[PDB]
Structures are given as structure tokens and as C-alpha cells.
Amino acid sequence: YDDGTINRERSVSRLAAVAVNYAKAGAHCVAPSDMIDGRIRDIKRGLINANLAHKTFVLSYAAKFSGNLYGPFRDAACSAPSNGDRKCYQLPPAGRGLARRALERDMSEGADGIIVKPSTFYLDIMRDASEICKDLPICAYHVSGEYAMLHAAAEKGVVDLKTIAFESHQGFLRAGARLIITYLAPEFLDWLDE
Amino acid sequence: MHTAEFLETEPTEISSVLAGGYNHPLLRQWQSERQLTKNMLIFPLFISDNPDDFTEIDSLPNINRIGVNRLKDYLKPLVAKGLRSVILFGVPLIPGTKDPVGTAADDPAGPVIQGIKFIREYFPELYIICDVCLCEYTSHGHCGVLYDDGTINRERSVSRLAAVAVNYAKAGAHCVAPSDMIDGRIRDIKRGLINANLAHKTFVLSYAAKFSGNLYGPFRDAACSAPSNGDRKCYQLPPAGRGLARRALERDMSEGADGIIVKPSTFYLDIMRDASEICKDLPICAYHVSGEYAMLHAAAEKGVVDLKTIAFESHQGFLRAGARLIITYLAPEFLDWLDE
Amino acid sequence: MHTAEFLETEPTEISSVLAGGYNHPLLRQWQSERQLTKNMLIFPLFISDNPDDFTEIDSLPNINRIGVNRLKDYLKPLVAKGLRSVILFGVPLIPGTKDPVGTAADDPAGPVIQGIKFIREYFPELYIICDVCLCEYTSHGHCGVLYDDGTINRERSVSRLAAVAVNYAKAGAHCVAPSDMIDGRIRDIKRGLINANLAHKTFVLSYAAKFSGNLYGPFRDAACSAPSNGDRKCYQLPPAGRGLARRALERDMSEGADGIIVKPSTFYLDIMRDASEICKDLPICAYHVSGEYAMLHAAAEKGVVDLKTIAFESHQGFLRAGARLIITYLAPEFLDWLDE
Amino acid sequence: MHTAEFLETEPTEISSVLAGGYNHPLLRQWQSERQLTKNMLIFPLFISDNPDDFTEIDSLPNINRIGVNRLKDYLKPLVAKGLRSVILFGVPLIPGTKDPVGTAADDPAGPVIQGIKFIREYFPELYIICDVCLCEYTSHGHCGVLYDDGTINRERSVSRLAAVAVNYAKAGAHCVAPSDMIDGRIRDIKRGLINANLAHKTFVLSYAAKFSGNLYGPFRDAACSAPSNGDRKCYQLPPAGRGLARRALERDMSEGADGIIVKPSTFYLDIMRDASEICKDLPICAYHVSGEYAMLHAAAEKGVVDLKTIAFESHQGFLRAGARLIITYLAPEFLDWLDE
Ligand SMILES: *[C@H](CCCCCC(=O)O)CCC(=O)O
Ligand SMILES: *[C@H](CCCCCC(=O)O)CCC(=O)O
Ligand SMILES: *[C@H](CCCCCC(=O)O)CCC(=O)O
Ligand SMILES: *[C@H](CCCCCC(=O)O)CCC(=O)O
Ligand SMILES: [Zn+2]
Ligand SMILES: [Zn+2]
Ligand SMILES: [Zn+2]
């Protein structure tokens, strides 16, 4: 909006277009990560009208929280909320009630799956999701801050990288996830073999 | 030209609109099921049998091993800042003090009981929790009395444990927190307290869901006791074992726990949630373990995160998952922050 | 002309649209609550008291009766392909070896215990499960000690059974799987293991929901023992009895089962689901029975189905219904397939 | 000597004792939540456009393709034995009769509608169910109208389907059973029936949970139509997909299904159970598929099982899992057996 807060209507309108265009280009799955109210509905409707809903997985970041764990990401995809705070749309860390409502909402609006982000620090929300979205695949996102915290701790000798990597990621599966987005995927491609 | 495309959309459904509930700073407080207060905080104390002790524990940043004559000067600022509870771990370093049956566990001249008498005299408003285990007192560093083969002897171990716990309560501990994970020990501790006419005044805070893992590093570097010859996995639950943790939670509640501890904490938030449903009528306590505590200190130092920010995030995480109590090495920092 | 008519319809409701979730090969993997892995597989072994045995079991395609000196050569390829667990059935063929009280059940020179010692020595990474029953050892071919009239004697039977199970664990079995279905036997087996100081290391895997039926054909043709004079229906549950199976499941869990077996499997998938709710905190195991296994081999041979396709369909069926373990005669084929 | 050992045991706990409930033949009837009756049975009919047809369907033992002038002589013994319901599948073999949009589906001179008029006139006590799909009528053998690329066109397909279903009801079908699995088709069929003033008298029996698999073999060998160029997996649910089946069940109920079909049956008993909870207020119907039916015939012939025994076991299995209806090719045998 002219004031700087977010314009729901024009934003979701813009977002649905992008998602559809990614699917037109050949993406199998779109994962909206904006957290703007009602965007999954408009993305699903957009895919329907484009005759792509029958082949596009909508993987919503349904429970995405504000926090101190996104550090390295901004240092990669170069984009950190200049002038403002992404807390008026990311949920507050203490807000379990809102996350539960956001989970039911995205499922009801057409999500085929949901992402919980960050992961370790939100395992209880993953569990909540496993009950509310029991018929849907749940995906854990091990965020750059969580990933950097493990690398740092190991380097300092607090823990062993591979041990704490398997512990944290088995932690996702214990809490209800059956999918994991992780920067340690290349190491896991190796380890799971042996 | 590639121009910005905008799809036609439907009017907003009311059911979509959540942001009305967290647009303002005070609303993100409204949205919390429990808010962090000072009396929620339990600070662990490692008591040495050298009474003039004050030794830095290598891998436990800003945490030390302290003897009785250094205790009042260390605990006075904290109690005057709002500290309400301590959890005691004894670290007897005198040679000859460890033995097969963990005899020194309840030695009246031992660090724990002396620590109990100290605090009871000089800080009688302080709530005293005592860890109950043999690992700190055994020659082999395990949490119970072994069989000749080296596995654990359930019967003799719980028999030994109940004695210790009762003795800690006799000495004046308000709360006993058994951390051994040996099957059925809460029953025998409760029965022991009953027969000693102390059950009506002793809180039994069970480490009901305690997991094996890579997060206990600095602790062993403090209370000097890491499972020589063997692995504490045959009694600590496997990290993937949600089913066993749920069963262990129902068991300890049914055996008399007044409260339960989930340990470690951040990495087991889903188990805390499980506990909040199964043990809904009981206080649930999070233990932020030395490995978790050291991981945060390390990450901050490296610039990955801000210590105080991630400390508040992690600990509010405990409250979100169902805990209303927190055992944490960051209690002294939180005594400061909660004021401002 | 008859032309193709098309009714006017409403815009698509989002609530109608599911295909977004399974349009791609990797999504049909995403959609599974559990994926089939190699360590899920338990392969049954029939051990003969003739140590040089290797006899084809007529009605059990590609499955044989093997003695101790033929075991290492038979199990070596499998363990090196990923086999992690075996379930042992003894087949004593020596005359004079069967008797009223099933004495040979725990004979230290008997096929089971000798099989246990063999595997423990030459394959110490293998997890050993022992079937626990008397039917293979009794003169009359029934699963417990009878009354003079021929019905089963609960007390003496469970007394006899607990002894056998404990003896198998003494000999080194990691897991005992009682398959008799006699009321209360899990309690007495657990108590027996407790008193022998073996409960802390022995998995009790109860055949909690075992049904009467037409699917056990080849088994009797292997372990030579089909209910002479009588019917095993007065202890196996009736196929229509869902209520009894549910009660039997709660009972065995409450009596100490660490896991439960549902048998047969395909034809009882709804009971597996029932078990997944009642015994939600316990591992559930599917037993693909010799009749089910022979039915698939027969159907394929006749061209009704493809063996490997229907094998993966049936066994993924177990995982869908709640099982995370499978006892199956197709384990050797699955050791191969899961690789590719 | 190795003697039979017997452990000391505790008195019997009442909670252990279940056998009091199934010791007698009439009790295994008491124990059933539903008993199999004759009016539960629905027999499929394959109607050819050659009215003098009576051709054996290779892979469907004792089942044939029949034209209108052979129908009364074939259905008379059955109706007089207790048959109450039929499910019609048309098999138009005349050249030029298949086409892109499945025009022949609701051809008034087509086998289905002619079959409807036949039965309505000569067997007006018979309840008529019509399969609703395009696969039997399309040039490419798929269950809906395709996009140029070959995937399925949801809108035009459901539009085409609703027309067919309504037309079957106009012709006098009592029940329509859509088997295409295309998202949202039940809504449009119900709306179509409403607008035609037929919803008050037409049962909509949805194939809500229909899975991909290896069990449909003989069917394609009967109704001649197997997915040329492609795979019916992008609309049939994956076998491992319990979550999708549960969602599909809630969807079809919410869209107006009066009943639901689970197909295949034995191999999906856990889904039947799921359905019994989600669609608890609706009749649930089991479809024993041609592959399942052929597998039983094959297994019996090979001696693995007894046909009638395993037929009663499997079909009582449907009732145990929650079904109160069964579509089965063994209906004629069951008309006989249920009498004795
Ligand atoms: C980006 C969506 C996924 C979270 C990035 C995860 C990571 O690697 O840190 C938006 C997140 C944000 O920067 O607010
Ligand atoms: C000690 C009981 C509490 C866990 C220690 C927490 C910490 O600060 O690391 C026994 C744990 C063990 O070492 O196994
Ligand atoms: C044997 C216990 C497991 C069932 C055998 C499974 C098979 O391969 O057929 C007792 C079953 C019995 O014969 O009653
Ligand atoms: C036909 C609908 C009912 C399933 C046929 C049952 C049988 O007798 O095999 C469509 C199924 C298909 O061929 O995909
Ligand atoms: Zn300990
Ligand atoms: Zn038996
Ligand atoms: Zn079709």
C-alpha cells in the first residue's frame, strides 16, 4: 500500500500469476512462501482456470514463523526486508493458535501439502500439523540459520555434525514430517548408503 | 516487454483473514498461551565436595562447579533478582568416594545434602530440587547398579535410587527429580516417600521422557561422569521412539509423578506437545541441556544468531509446546531481561 | 442421430480437486505413510533336527526345511543382501520326540535352540525371533496342554509356554513370539522373563490377533503338525469376530506385549488398521501366511497377476494399514527388488 | 534327561479370559457385527450389443457376455433363488460405435439402456445399478474426455458423465455408480439428477475409493477396454495413498453420494474400515474384482485353498470391515450356499 503495509488483493493477484506461470513453464510443484492471507485459494483457482491443477502440487508454507533463523538465506537470495519488518505476515513464534488456524485454512483452500518452517525450533507445530493435516504430506524446512547453527556448533566441538544432523532430521520424521527440505541433502545422499 | 501479470480474483473470504489478530506488539503477547515469568525458571547448581570450589566447566559457558563456602555469594544476587528454584547436582571429587553401589549419593557430608542444608539455612525462600541418580557416584559412571555382565540391575538399582531420593527429602529437599530412566523407579520412589511420611510434602518431578543423543556434552564435562565401558542407550529412549516416550509418560504419571521433565528440549518439542496432552493435568518442565545451551552460545559467537533473541525464541518455544517450567543455564540472563 | 450430450456445470470447487497430489511418480511415494525398507523384513526359517537337511516343503514354493549344517550357506547371501531378522520354527522329525506336554519344545539339543546358538555364533548381527508354541512338539498337534476331554488346559499350557519362551531367551533369542492364542499367556511369559532377569532385553511379540481360516495350508505341510483329532477354532478367533480381536489386542498390550502380530495379513487388513489405533504406541507386524503366499504364486502362474507387482501391492498394503514390520516368505525376492 | 519345565503362575485374571465368548458354533455367529444375507449381493452383468450373445470371458471363470434375448433365461433361476440386484456393464462390439466423446454410452439402442428396459419389463422386482463411465465407449479406452495432450479433461468429462448418468436414470435405472474417479464428478451427477427431477429416486453409489493395481485383469478381458496409450493411474488412487482415499471418501459424501464402493476389496480391507468411520451413516459396498475372483479360483484349482471356504472367508471379511453390500461374481454360488 502507499503506506508500506502489504496490499492483500494486488499481492495475491500477482502471486497467483507467478505460480501459474511457473507451472506453465514446467514446474511440478509450487510452494508459496509469502504468508499473505488467502493466497492459496487464488493460486489454486488460477491453476484450475489454466487447466494445470490436475498436475501441479501446491505445497503451502502454511506455518511460517518470524524469528532469528533466516540469516544465511538473505545472504544468498539477497533480499532482507528493507524499511520494515516481515512480522506483520510471518506468524509470531508464540502464536500456536494462529498457526493451527493457518494450517486448517491452507488445507481448506487447496494445499496438497504443507511446509513447517523453521523446523527443529518448531517441532511442536509439526506435530500439530500431523493431526490437523493428517491426510496430507508434511514437509520440514531446515532453515539456513538452523543449518548454520549446526555447522558452527560442530566446528566448536559442541556436537558431531553427522550425529546431530541425523538426530535433528530424524526429529522431523518423529514429529510427523515425511518430507525434508535441507541443505544437508548432499551429505545425506552419501550417509544413507552406509 | 515482459509485464507484471495479475489474475482476476474472487472477493476475500472472511475465513482467509488472520492478520487482524497479530498486527500490533501487544497482540503477539495476546497470542501466547503462556507468558514467560521469572518463577518459571529453575537454575542448576553443580556442588563440589571442595567447599572453596569455583571452577569453570570447560564446555559450559559461564557455568561453574561451586563448593558450600562460595554458594551464598553466588546465589545472593540471583535470589534478589527473582530466582525462585534450584536443581542440585553433586560433583564429589575426593578419591575413594565412588563405588559400585553409589554409596556417596546420599552421604550426609556429601555435596548434595550439604548444599541442601546450606540453602535451607541461608535462602529459606528458595525451592530446592535434587537430581536423583547414581551416575555421579558410581565407579563405572552408569545410572544404576549393574549385573555382573554390565547391563543394569533393575531391582537393586531402583531400590538404591528410592533410598537416595527419600534421604534427599529427609535432609530437606522440596523436590526430587529422578533422571536414571530405569523402568518403574517412580513407583518405588513414591512408595518410599509414603513409608517415610514425606509424600505429602515432596514433589516428584520425573524425567519421564529423556532421550539418548549428542546434546549432553558439557554436562559430562561438569559433573564428571560419562558412561565408561558401555552406552546409556539401553535405558535412555531412542530419539525416533515416539511410541516409547508416550508410554513412558503415561507410566510415570500413573506411578505417581507430580510433574514431568522432557529432556533435551528444543530438539524434542514435539514430545513436549505429546506430554501436554497425555499429562495435561500435570506441570511440564523443559530442560535446555548443556549441548543445546552450548550450541546457542557457539552460533551467536559465530554470528549465525543473536544470543538474547534466539534465547527468547527457544524458551518461548518451550511454553508454546506446553511447558510451564524451564530448567535452564540461561536463568541468570533471563533474570535480567524479564525486567526490561 | 444420437449425439453426445453434455450438461451445463458449475465452476470447479477447489474442495473437489485431489489429483494435484499424485500426478508424478515421486508423488505416489510422497503419499505413502510408510515406505518399504529392507530392515522391515523378517524371514521365517524351518529348522529340522536332521542337521544335513534341505527338503522342499511341498506346498511352500521355494521354501525348505533346513538343518544346522546347511544354515550358513543358505543365510549368507541373504544377510549380505540386507536381511536383518529371522523367525525360527523347529521341525523335530526324530521318532519319540513328541509327547503330551511338548517336552522337546525347549530341548537344548533341539532344532530351535541349536538354530539359536548357530546364528548367534555365525551371524551375530541377525535379530532372532522364536515362535513359541507346543503344536510342533505335541503328540496330538495342538498348541497347549489338554484336559482329559481334549479341550485345552489354560493353566498348565501357559505354564508350559512361559517356560519355553524363557528358555529360548536364555539360549539367546532376542525376541519371543507366542502363537498359541491361549488366554493370558502373555502375562505369564512376561512375568517369567522378569523373574529370569531377561525382560529388559527380550522383545515380546504377541500374535494378538490370530484368526481361524483356510490360509495355513502349506505351513502344516512344512512344520508337520495339523490339529489331529479336533479343531484349533476354540482358541483361534473366528474370522467375523472383530470385537474379540479388538479385546485380544488390548489384552496382550496390557499384559506386556512389546509388539503385536496380525495373522493372516491381506485378508485381515481391517484388523491391522484396528490394531494401529488400539496399539498405536507399539510396532505392528504383518504375517503373510503360507496360504496367502501360495495363492499369489498360484495366481501368477495362471496368469491372473504378475508375481512381483502383486507382491509389492500386497506388502505395501500392510504398510498402508498400519504395519511397520512384515514376516514374509517373499523376503529373499524383496532383498533383490528393493535395491532396484 | 531334558524334562518338561513348568513355571509357577498367578491365578487367572478375569481380564485375560475371552474364550467364553466363542466356544460354540452359534457363538461365532453372535460375534459377527453383520451376517451375510442374500439381498446384500449384487451380481454384475455384461451386456453385448449382439442380442443373441453368450460368450465366455476368457479370464472370468463362469462369467459371460450376454445379449438381450439371452437375458431372461439366464436371470430367471437367479431371481428365483433370491437375487435382488444387478450392476450393468455394456459391451458394444459393433464397429464404428466407439468415439472420442463416448457417444454410445447413453445410446438408447445401446446394450445398457436396452438391458435396462429388458429387466424393467421382465424382472420388475430386480434393483438395477448402472456403472457410469466412458472407458467402454471411447476410442482410446479411458474413463473421460481427453485434452489434446492425452491427459484427462475434467470439465468436459464430468459434463459428459453427468449426462450419461441422468440418461440411465431416465431410462429406468434405480442406481448409478460412477467409476471414473474424476475429481468432482459426483457433484455434477447429483446436480444433473436434481435438475431432471430424478434425485428423489436415484441412488448415487460412488466408487469413492478406487485404486490402481494388478487386480483388474479379467474385467478388461470382458468389457474389452484397457487403457490404450497411457495409464489410468493419474486418476485411480495409488495403492499406498490412504490420505487421498480418506479425502476422496469425504469429498464424494459431501458431493451427494448415497453410498460408496471400495474397490478392490480384500486387498483394501483397511480402506473399507476407514470408510466405515468416515461414511458411517452411509451404506458401504465391497467390490470383489475380477482379479481377486480369478485369484481365488486359481488358488483352489491348485489346491492351496477350498473355493467355498475361502469365498465365505473373504466375503465375511467385507462385512467385518464395515460393508453391508457386496458386488461379486460369486453371487450365483452364494445364492445356493446361503440356503444350506
Ligand atoms: C523464503 C522461503 C523459505 C525460507 C528460507 C529458508 C532458509 O534457507 O533460510 C522466505 C523466508 C524469509 O526470508 O522470510
Ligand atoms: C543428567 C540429568 C539431566 C540431564 C543433564 C542436562 C545437561 O545439562 O546436559 C543425566 C544426563 C546424562 O548425562 O545422561
Ligand atoms: C503357526 C504360527 C504362525 C502362523 C503360520 C504362518 C504360515 O506360514 O502359514 C501356528 C499357525 C497354525 O498352524 O495354526
Ligand atoms: C470398471 C469399474 C469397476 C471395476 C471392475 C471390477 C472388475 O470386475 O474387475 C473400471 C475399472 C477399470 O478397469 O479401471
Ligand atoms: Zn544418571
Ligand atoms: Zn501353535
Ligand atoms: Zn472407466
CA-closest candidate to residue C315, choices C269, C261, C274: C269
Phi/psi for D209 (5° steps) reads: -115, 90
- Nearest chain A Cα distance for residue B294, angstroms: 6
Query: CA B13 → CA A8, A39, B7, B18, D306, distances in Å?
Result: 12, 11, 17, 11, 60
Residue A90 amino acid letter:
Q
Which residue numbers of D have CB closer than 8 Å to A's CBs? 147, 151-154, 183, 234, 242-244, 246-247
Cβ contacts from C onto D, under 8 A = 292
Place of cell 473355493: D307
Residue B14 amino acid letter:
I
**C299 CA to middle of ligand 3, Å?**
21
| E strands present in B82-223 | 85-91, 127-132, 175-178, 203-210
CA-closest candidate to residue C298, choices D266, D297, D217, D311: D297
Tell if the CB–CB gap between B23 and A88 is shorter than 8 Å. Answer: yes
Place of cell 541461608: B122
Which residue numbers of A have CB closer than 8 Å to D's CBs? 51, 54-55, 134-137
Handedness of CA C325, C327, C328, C333 (dihedral sign): positive
Give D-chain residues touching A137 at CB under 8 angstroms: 243
Place of cell 545434602: B113
Query: CA B93 → CA B53, B68, B132, distances in Å?
Result: 11, 14, 18
Ligand closest in space to the Cα of B294: 2
Tell if the CB–CB gap between A134 and D234 is shorter than 8 Å. Answer: no
- Give the other-Cβ count within 10 Å of D307's Cβ: 15
Q: What is the 3-state secondary structure (H, E, C) of D197-217?
A: CCCCCCEEEEEEEEECCCCCH
Residue C49 amino acid letter:
D
**A33 CA to middle of ligand 1, Å?**
8
Handedness of CA A127, A133, A134, A139 (dihedral sign): negative
**D130 marked among binding-site residues:** no
Distance of alpha carbon D323 from alpha carbon D316, whole angstroms: 9
Handedness of CA C110, C204, C174, C192 (dihedral sign): negative
List of residues 6+ apart from C149 with CB closer than 8 A: none
Tell if the CB–CB gap between D18 and C247 is shorter than 8 Å. Answer: yes
The β-bridge partners of B192 are none
**C290 marked among binding-site residues:** yes
Distance of alpha carbon C101 from alpha carbon B46, whole angstroms: 60
The grid coordinates listed for D28 are: 461365532
Distance of alpha carbon C79 from alpha carbon C118, whole angstroms: 14
The grid coordinates listed for B331 are: 536463568
CB of residue A143 inside a 6 A radius of ligand 1: yes
Distance of alpha carbon B91 from alpha carbon B96, whole angstroms: 13
Instruction: Say if residue C227 is exposed, middle or buried (CB neighbours under 10 Å; 0-12, 13-18, 19+).
Output: middle
- Nearest chain C Cα distance for residue A82, angstroms: 36
Give A-chain residues touching C27 at CB under 8 angstroms: 57
Catalytic residue annotation of C: 210, 263
Q: Distance between the two ends of chain A, CA-based, in angstroms?
A: 54
Length, in residues, of chain A: 194
Instruction: Give pairs for C66-71: CB < 8 Å, separation 24+.
Output: C67/C111, C68/C111, C68/C114, C68/C115, C68/C118, C71/C45, C71/C47, C71/C115, C71/C118, C71/C119, C71/C122
| Closest chain C residue by Cα to residue A180 | C30
CA-closest candidate to residue D20, choices D34, D33, D32, D31: D31
Angle at A28 between CA A24 and CA A32, to 5 degrees: 85
For a substitution probing ligand 1, which of A117, A121, A150, A184 has the most ligand atoms within 8 Å of its CB? A117
Check if the beta carbon of residue D170 is closer than 8 Å to that of residue D223: no
**C48 marked among binding-site residues:** no
Distance of alpha carbon A31 from alpha carbon B261, whole angstroms: 37
Tell if the CB–CB gap between D243 and A54 is shorter than 8 Å. Answer: no
Residue burial B214-251, b: 16+ Cβ < 10 Å; e: rest? bbbbbbbbbbbbeeeeeebeebbbebebbebbbbbbeb
- Give the other-Cβ count within 10 Å of B307's Cβ: 15
The H-or-E segment that residue B308 falls in is: helix B307-320
| Closest chain A residue by Cα to residue C339 | A193
Q: Which of A42, A45, A48 to mutate to test the interface with C (most CBs of C within 10 A)?
A: A48
In three-state secondary structure terms, C87 is strand
Distance of alpha carbon D61 from alpha carbon D329, whole angstroms: 9
The grid coordinates listed for B173 are: 529437599
Give B-chain residues touching A170 at CB under 8 angstroms: 239-240
Q: Distance between the two ends of chain D, CA-based, in angstroms?
A: 54
* Closest ligand 4 atom, residue D222 Cα: 8
**D320 marked among binding-site residues:** no
**C177 CA to middle of ligand 6, Å?**
11
**D121 CA to middle of ligand 4, Å?**
28
Q: Which of C273, C296, C297, C316 to mutate to test the interface with D (most CBs of D within 10 A)?
A: C273
Residue B318 amino acid letter:
F
Tell if the CB–CB gap between D298 and C304 is shorter than 8 Å. Answer: yes
B308 is catalytic: no
Residues preceding discontinuities in chain C at C–N > 2.5 Å? none
Q: What is the 3-state secondary structure (H, E, C) of chain D?
A: CCCCCCCCCCCCCHHHCCHHHCCCCCHHHHCCCCCCCHHHEEEEEEEECCCCCEEECCCCCCCEEECHHHHHHHHHHHHHHCCCEEEEEEECCCCCCCCCCCHHHHCCCCHHHHHHHHHHHHCCCCEEEEEECCCCCCCCCCCCCECCCCCECHHHHHHHHHHHHHHHHHHCCCEEEECCCCCCHHHHHHHHHHHCCCCCCCEEEEEEEEECCCCCHHHHCCCCCCCCCCCCCCCCECCCCHHHHHHHHHHHHHCCCCEEEEECCHHHHHHHHHHHHHCCCCCEEEECCHHHHHHHHHHHHCCCCCHHHHHHHHHHHHHHCCCCEEECCCHHHHHHHCCC
Cβ contacts from B onto C, under 8 A = 17
* Distance of alpha carbon C282 from the chain centroid: 16
Distance of alpha carbon B326 from alpha carbon B311, whole angstroms: 12
The grid coordinates listed for D186 are: 459426483
Query: CA C69 → CA B122, C49, C50, C63, C75, distances in Å?
Result: 74, 11, 9, 17, 11
Check if the beta carbon of residue B172 is closer than 8 Å to that of residue B178: no
Distance of alpha carbon D111 from alpha carbon B65, whole angstroms: 91
Instruction: Say if residue B73 is exposed, middle or buried (CB neighbours under 10 Å; 0-12, 13-18, 19+).
Output: exposed
DSSP tag of C11: P
**D137 CA to middle of ligand 7, Å?**
9
In three-state secondary structure terms, B161 is helix
The protein residue whose alpha carbon is closest to atom 10 in ligand 2 is: B179
Strand order in the sheet with A29-30: A29-30, A57-64, A113-117, A138-141, A179-181
Question: In chain A, what's the furthest Cα-to-Cα distance?
Answer: 56
Phi/psi for B5 (5° steps) reads: -95, 145
Length, in residues, of chain D: 340
Phi/psi for C117 (5° steps) reads: -60, -35
Tell if the CB–CB gap between C5 and D268 is shorter than 8 Å. Answer: no
- Nearest chain B Cα distance for residue A67, angstroms: 7
Distance of alpha carbon A87 from alpha carbon A66, whole angstroms: 6
CA-closest candidate to residue C283, choices C235, C254, C319: C319
In three-state secondary structure terms, C206 is strand
Query: CA C191 → CA A165, C131, C159, C213, distances in Å?
Result: 40, 18, 11, 31
Among left, alpha and beta (phi > 0; psi -120 to 50; other), residue D259 is beta
Q: Resolution to 1 decimal, in Å?
A: 1.8
The β-bridge partners of C130 are C88, C176
Which residue numbers of C have CB closer than 8 Å to A's CBs? 12, 14-15, 17, 19-21, 23-24, 27, 30-33
CA-closest candidate to residue A172, choices A141, A147, A151, A128: A141
DSSP notation for C157-197: HHHHHHHHHHHHHHHT-SEEEE-S--TTHHHHHHHHHHHTT
**D135 marked among binding-site residues:** yes
- Give the other-Cβ count within 10 Å of C232's Cβ: 18
Distance of alpha carbon C106 from alpha carbon C112, whole angstroms: 8
Domains of chain C: 1-340 (3.20.20.70)
Which among A108, A110, A178 has the least Cβ separation from residue C17?
A: A110
DSSP notation for B262-277: EES-GGGHHHHHHHHH
**C202 CA to middle of ligand 2, Å?**
27
Torsion of CA C6, C8, C14, C15, to 10 degrees: -80
Check if the beta carbon of residue A93 is closer than 8 Å to that of residue B317: yes
Question: In chain B, what's the furthest Cα-to-Cα distance?
Answer: 86
In three-state secondary structure terms, B303 is coil
Instruction: Say if residue A17 is exposed, middle or buried (CB neighbours under 10 Å; 0-12, 13-18, 19+).
Output: middle
The grid coordinates listed for A153 are: 556448533
B190 is catalytic: no
Among left, alpha and beta (phi > 0; psi -120 to 50; other), residue A84 is left
Residue A192 amino acid letter:
L
Distance of alpha carbon C28 from alpha carbon D243, whole angstroms: 11
Deposited experimental method: X-ray
**D284 CA to middle of ligand 1, Å?**
46
List of residues 6+ apart from D306 with CB closer than 8 A: C214, D300
Chains A and C touch (3+ CB pairs under 8 A): yes
- Nearest chain A Cα distance for residue C35, angstroms: 10
Distance of alpha carbon B38 from alpha carbon B339, whole angstroms: 9
Which among B32, B239, B309 has the least Cβ separation from residue A170?
A: B239
In three-state secondary structure terms, B237 is strand
Residue burial D21-31, b: 16+ Cβ < 10 Å; e: rest? bbeeeebbeeb
Tell if the CB–CB gap between A71 and B304 is shorter than 8 Å. Answer: yes
Distance of alpha carbon C296 from alpha carbon A41, whole angstroms: 46
| E strands present in chain C | 41-48, 54-56, 64-66, 85-91, 127-132, 175-178, 203-210, 259-263, 284-287, 325-327
The grid coordinates listed for C269 are: 487388513
Handedness of CA D48, D50, D54, D55 (dihedral sign): negative
The grid coordinates listed for B286 are: 523443559
CA-closest candidate to residue C218, choices C38, C92, C46: C46
The grid coordinates listed for D254 are: 459431501
**D220 marked among binding-site residues:** yes
List of residues 6+ apart from B221 with CB closer than 8 A: B57, B58, B59, B60, B290
Place of cell 494435484: C20
The grid coordinates listed for B283 are: 506441570
CB of residue A115 inside a 6 A radius of ligand 1: no
Distance of alpha carbon D37 from alpha carbon C16, whole angstroms: 35
Query: CA B131 → CA B169, B177, B213, B327, D144, distances in Å?
Result: 12, 5, 19, 12, 68
Place of cell 508410554: B247
Rg, chain B, Cα only: 22
* Closest ligand 1 atom, residue A74 Cα: 13
Which among B147, B153, B246 has the least Cβ separation from residue C281?
A: B246
- Nearest chain D Cα distance for residue C19, angstroms: 7
Angle at C275 between CA C269 and CA C276, to 5 degrees: 90
DSSP H helices, chain A, are: 8-25, 39-49, 71-74, 96-108, 123-132, 144-155, 161-174, 185-191
- Nearest chain A Cα distance for residue C125, angstroms: 15
DSSP notation for C100-157: TT-GGGG-TTSHHHHHHHHHHHH-TTSEEEEEE-STTT-TT--SSPBPTTSSB-HHHH
Place of cell 502362474: C301
Check if the beta carbon of residue C63 is closer than 8 Å to that of residue C333: no
In three-state secondary structure terms, A51 is coil
Query: CA C111 → CA C60, C74, C207, D20, D164, distances in Å?
Result: 20, 16, 22, 36, 66
Strands D64-66 and D54-56: antiparallel
Handedness of CA B322, B328, B330, B331 (dihedral sign): positive
Handedness of CA B337, B324, B130, B311 (dihedral sign): negative
Distance of alpha carbon A142 from alpha carbon A160, whole angstroms: 17
Angle at B47 between CA B44 and CA B49, to 5 degrees: 170
